[PDB]
Amino acid sequence: MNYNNKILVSESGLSQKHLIHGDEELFQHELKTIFARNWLFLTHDSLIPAPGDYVTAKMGIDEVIVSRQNDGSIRAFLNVCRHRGKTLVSVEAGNAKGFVCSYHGWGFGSNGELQSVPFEKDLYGESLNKKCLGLKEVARVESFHGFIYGCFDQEAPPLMDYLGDAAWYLEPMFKHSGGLELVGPPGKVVIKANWKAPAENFVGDAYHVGWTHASSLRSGESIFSSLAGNAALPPEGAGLQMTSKYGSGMGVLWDGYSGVHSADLVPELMAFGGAKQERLNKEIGDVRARIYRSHLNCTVFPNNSMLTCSGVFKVWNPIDANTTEVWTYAIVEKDMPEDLKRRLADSVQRTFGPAGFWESDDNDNMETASQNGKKYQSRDSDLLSNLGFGEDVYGDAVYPGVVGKSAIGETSYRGFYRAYQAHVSSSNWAEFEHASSTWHTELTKTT
Amino acid sequence: MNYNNKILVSESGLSQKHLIHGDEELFQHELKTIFARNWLFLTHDSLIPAPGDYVTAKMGIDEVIVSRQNDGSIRAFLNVCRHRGKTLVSVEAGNAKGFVCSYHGWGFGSNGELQSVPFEKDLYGESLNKKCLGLKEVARVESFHGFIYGCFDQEAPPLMDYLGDAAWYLEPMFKHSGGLELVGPPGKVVIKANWKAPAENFVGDAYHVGWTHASSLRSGESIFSSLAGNAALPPEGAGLQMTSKYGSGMGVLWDGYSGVHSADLVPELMAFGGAKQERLNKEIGDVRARIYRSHLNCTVFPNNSMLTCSGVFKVWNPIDANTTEVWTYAIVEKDMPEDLKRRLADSVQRTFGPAGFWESDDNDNMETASQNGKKYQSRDSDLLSNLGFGEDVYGDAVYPGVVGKSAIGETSYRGFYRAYQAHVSSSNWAEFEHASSTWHTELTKTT
Amino acid sequence: MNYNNKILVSESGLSQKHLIHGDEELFQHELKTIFARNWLFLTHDSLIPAPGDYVTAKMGIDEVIVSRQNDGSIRAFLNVCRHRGKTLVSVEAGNAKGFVCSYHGWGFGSNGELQSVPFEKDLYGESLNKKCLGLKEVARVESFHGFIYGCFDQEAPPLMDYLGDAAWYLEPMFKHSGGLELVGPPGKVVIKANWKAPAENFVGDAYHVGWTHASSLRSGESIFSSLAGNAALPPEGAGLQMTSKYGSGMGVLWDGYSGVHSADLVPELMAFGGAKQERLNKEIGDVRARIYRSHLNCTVFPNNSMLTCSGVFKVWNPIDANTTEVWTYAIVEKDMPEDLKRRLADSVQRTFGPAGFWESDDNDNMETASQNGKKYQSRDSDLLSNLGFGEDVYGDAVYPGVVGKSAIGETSYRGFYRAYQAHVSSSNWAEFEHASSTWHTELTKTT
Amino acid sequence: MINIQEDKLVSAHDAEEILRFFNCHDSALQQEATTLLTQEAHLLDIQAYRAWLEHCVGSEVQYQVISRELRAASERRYKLNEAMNVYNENFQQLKVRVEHQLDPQNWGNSPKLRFTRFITNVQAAMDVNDKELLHIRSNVILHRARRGNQVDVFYAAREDKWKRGEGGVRKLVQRFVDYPERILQTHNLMVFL
Amino acid sequence: MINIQEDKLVSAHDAEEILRFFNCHDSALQQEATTLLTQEAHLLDIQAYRAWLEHCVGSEVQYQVISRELRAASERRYKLNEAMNVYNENFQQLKVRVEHQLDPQNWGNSPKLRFTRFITNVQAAMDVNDKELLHIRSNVILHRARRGNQVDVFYAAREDKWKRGEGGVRKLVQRFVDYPERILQTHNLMVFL
Amino acid sequence: MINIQEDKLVSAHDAEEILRFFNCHDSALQQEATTLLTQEAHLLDIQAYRAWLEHCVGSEVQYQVISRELRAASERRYKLNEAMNVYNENFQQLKVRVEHQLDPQNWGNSPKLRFTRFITNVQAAMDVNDKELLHIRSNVILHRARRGNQVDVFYAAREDKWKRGEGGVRKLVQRFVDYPERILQTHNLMVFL
Ligand code: FES
Ligand code: FES
């Protein structure tokens, strides 16, 4: 397939070829143009707070070691020995000053440097240039209020710029609430879906909630329980959708601070968020203080998703075109009482974890949609994302980004796929930028 | 591989490159030139008799919904939602006036039309052109005496013409007996063989019966039990072989009405078929009445096989080059007493079903022959199908088609592979026809 | 990938692209340029000593039947029927005058000839040219002191020439000891590693022993137990490394006759080998008699490895780029007492067999190194094999081949990969020879 | 115990079968059933099929394994055959299958197959009306290995009826299995569950 | 029995749990535990989830399944949360999960799922201080089949506490499972182990 | 019971082994054997390998697991070694393997492995000549999980001899397994069956 010319995503993001969820050649191409190019979630400060603390993470199909340096910074390295290519670290987290390879015993520092080689003097003499044999380093590592992302591409925009208009929506919770912590370890489960299926679902899919999750809504008794079975459409102005230049996007459901949490946690959460909102009104203004305690379903392009308030934090780790490894963490506000944080963390896993009754509702949707992308008669068919098209705005006085002023639509799908197509057809960041010079105009056509 | 020039099947169908059973690129090419082009078995009237009745079926690797319309006709649709591509129907059979997608709740009629969309008015307004969003419809759906076939290609010959000279042999049982019913549900089992291995075996392989099925012949005590272990060759004139322009073909074993059925059913069957034959002598003539109660081992090109009289009906559903999903139904004569139909249906599964002791004899043959097609030193080797070559006739006064007037030979392999090669090297039906303008002359060379 | 130009192995064998352990297109290319071209281990005289004795073996991904002929010679044939391609022989060893196909009953002799066809007279008449329908024969089959190798390529060098300078090192044990026997049957285990990972490890990896096998060294109490955990470097002159034109290579650890065998067998072995060495001093000279009872870790290019003295004999049978089927036999000296041979055979399996505690130490090393070769950021990275480079010699007065006069280095990796690269970039043996006209000069650069 | 109007996923058949075991617990019957099944599984595992027929299988046996078509949990109109019979064997039909296994020209049996059966969750209860009829429920994992690298694993619940026959030996008079996997991924179901 | 300074791979928890069974062997308690677990597994296998709650599960239950992060065998400094809770359910939370299963709009339940559970290695001992508290250990293989060709098999050891409740019926008051597979390859863990 | 001339697939060894259990049934011996094996499996599952050696394994033990070469069912001439020993261990050799497992530089053991064993189909009989020798047959499924996504499952029948040793404790003096899979698809067989 010629990725320069092939129209995988139609103008304005209105449709996508179904093959994008099944094609293995395209998957290989995404490793290059999506995952080796863009910012990917690694970990949180709260998981590696002290010098020497480390975790392993995936970046696309690569595995990296993410380590807290002596000077407080974080560096990340390919988890691959520089000698004969063995995986260096076989655990998920720990604390160490270095990593010794179990094959021939080369010892690398927490800083990635080749520090020691067994019998170096007797074997290599002064011949080994250890200075050139440090672990392959992730070019860029940046923090968004404690959340650490990495990028293999030195030419990438800074993480803050990359978040674009989405950053404004995240800041109330990520910054102004006093800060978040990630509660680990994550649940990890393999699903038979393309990474883009859950990514698109979290970026912009409010439409499915009432029908897909009818049973969970009815059973769990959460603040959204009236949606069950499409018995009721949310009020006018119940929320909105947004998207951004680099593909990140989210839904906003006004005031839904208890999110998917079952009746047992609703009163406590609604009290906590409401009390913080009252304090935030004076600091960041009414609208943004209200955003803090509104439920955001967001995807940070390409494969990191979250539900604020519900506290669900996801990484959709790609394996092949119909395989994804799902990592599920809980996010909690640092100043919540510890007992509430524990219960909130359990409730996130209860609903969206490996045995998450909500997450299980989505399994068949994602898996069959992805697998149908391989089927001959479906490859060239068009997945539709036209809901709300011609009603989106850009440059609104209050809400930034390309914005659909309705709770349910496909605004965020269109922006996600616009960015996806611009990347897959581009060779580098300069070409993506050229391809994206009229991004918001493309998204608001017929408006 | 250049399919226009590559000789995968030698002149007159005499040999085939072994790679055809293992090559995944060729498998992908077959999806296009074999399965998207030709007629494929869907179901029987008897399985969807009433308005709203439906079943799911495979057509190549695609899944379709096959539904009885209010007006008595049958239409078939891709089992894939027009919105985000989820599989619409997750069951194998049922009765409904429509199908609602479990992702976002779009509701399609039994006629494929998009009938409803949740909150259409509030969400899409008058923007959604439902008229253009009906399920993708199978272009052609036709019946052969109750047996329903589908074809994605609008340019295909009518099903009756496609059956060619094979139709004449099927009619006594399919039409003149009063009609057949398919007894479901089918057995379903995955084998590690290419779809063409069982297809070729059923189209024309009498040679293997005595040796492959030695144990089943000896143990089961069927009317063919003397063949066990190649202890005896069938008499002169014990049968014949035929093949046809579009690849369908069969063996005829004179008078073998009880087929593979064990001694417990032999007397009852031989009585039943003989009594019907006596009535048919006056209606269709002696030869054709005798064909009615003779055992036909047939493949309807490409991947539908059957043993009349034995009542075995097979679909070899392709999965990849070394994987096939085998569906096994029983066929019974509608005017048989119900107790006989029940016992006949059990006996079909007993011999050729998921635990079929006969079918199990064939497993290693098919699987290793297919898997050897991937092995380096075998890819370019030639599978032989020259038995009886130079003794076949065309345009015989009594038996139509290209015909080998012997019970055992490879006439039907040659016609199957001739048609296969003409399709794989052709871009459309017009080119197949041009490639097939001297089909019978090619098959009878040296005669 | 253009194999003519792509530098997969750098000049002097100094580094290799990590993708060589993961790339499936390259694996397919190796079937042609490595396995269809070179000599591959089949069996030992001791396993098929009598007329009619046979075994099955793999040659690359192909399976062959290896049969002792009436005249005492050995011929080998593809284990694939000439009719419809079924696997002929389903067992691993036996004795027979021929092989009958279970599909249609064609009967082939031990000599590969088509001898009988069921009902040949009635079916084929005189039409079947059986003379042209013999099993596909392995072009070349040769013996190295009882060890039988095969080669599909008639143009290959004789096996003795192919072993090159490595032969001189093997002869004391293989020839002058009175001869070896292979004790079967082999252990067989599938590992998730590329065949080259264990191949390279056995050809030249002394560096890993102290660290990888720290636990086995400490626990087993073998004559190398002091290496455990890199607690001690072997003495100066403890051994050497060699390599050869056609890629075969080995390490020599002076005097280590008991090898990996646990303390329970050390005294008996050290006595036995020492007594034989004293007799050999007069026949082959001191140096070569000492080689007889020194531990050789060798790979016979491409995928046959061994540890003399330890008595481990391995075939790394390729399945795909990250799958290998490991066959493990024991080698014993024919004139050892039978009770010692039995105990030695058990000890080989105890250490290096399916439950071999030593072999298990290597699993993660091989599997992760191979699987990392598929990971995007590692594909174009360089595996290093520069240890000892610039200190190797060629044409030494005492030790032939390209030789590193140290126990630990990567001399043998460099020669293995030099030969590998010359084959993958060549179309036939003539081109390999042209590519290899300055092989030893390339290996000793900077010396 | 079970109300199937409230326990909406439970079939009438399943609720009927469970009542049979919850009521009368007879510890020694559970032990007799365990022995019977362990011995049967041993005979089958070593491929003593004639011994199995002679010692474990009653002359009036019905040996039945069905595959049920996938239908909507809400389905109420479509009333055609719900299942097919993978096995539905009388004693003579079992004997045919046993002869087929033992025939020296059953090429698929060379080299010899390897079976290992794991029987668990045994429950036993006498029938309420026929005091000579023992109901036994048990679950089986059946492992079948052949030809180097073929491995198939079968999983099933078995509803059996066993009755004293000749010599006073308890023999199988009915086995019923509703096979849980609709599309078999084991090449075939040619094993005695 | 176990010294964990010498048996270096054994956790303190594991060594504690084993001491509980090696000492007092009570053959009839082992038999009561076997019955309890076989009946529970039967109810679960037929999807009688309401009956399971009513008959097997105590009002004070803690139903817990953890996934432990992979850490170095030698790790001594890193002291953050070692595990997450796949399940950590009180009775009300189990009831929520049961309602979700029985809801007619749980689309994933049509066509009906098939479960088969294999319970083995049952051990039982009364608690030393609370003579009304029964410790039961058992291993489960759980086979789940759905939608033609989906098959998932789960493997776990279960550490249970069971106590007589109302009607004198022994009910589950604690189940603890440390799930052995870190990355699940079964689509989800939405099954009652 | 078994005539191997009629039951043509049954080996002489298998027919010999079965006779041993069909005759004398001793219900309490079956129960003692079940306890012994459940406790052994518990110790092994928690990786208390030293405790296993001390409490379960006799000083005179032969611990043997073979892999048999695939030969024609009709083969009568070819008479070379029929099997190789995956394990053929005396007590000292088992101790070596146990030390290897416990060594802090066994890199493959970090992070810690997870084992779950399922023991079923226990049969027990005293030997006819040595009244101190107990024959025990049992089947095992062994589940081994490591490093996130590696899962290997082993299946075997075990023919054991157990004898009272010091302290009167019944200990394993022989274990024999004929491993059913010829080509292992589990990376290695480095587990104690
Ligand atoms: S591969 Fe890491 S030290 Fe050699
Ligand atoms: S995918 Fe079917 S309604 Fe959206």
Ligand code: FES
């Ligand atoms: S495939 Fe061997 S005789 Fe036909």
Ligand SMILES: [Fe+3]
């Ligand atoms: Fe959802």
Ligand SMILES: [Fe+3]
């Ligand atoms: Fe057949």
Ligand SMILES: [Fe+3]
């Ligand atoms: Fe090693």
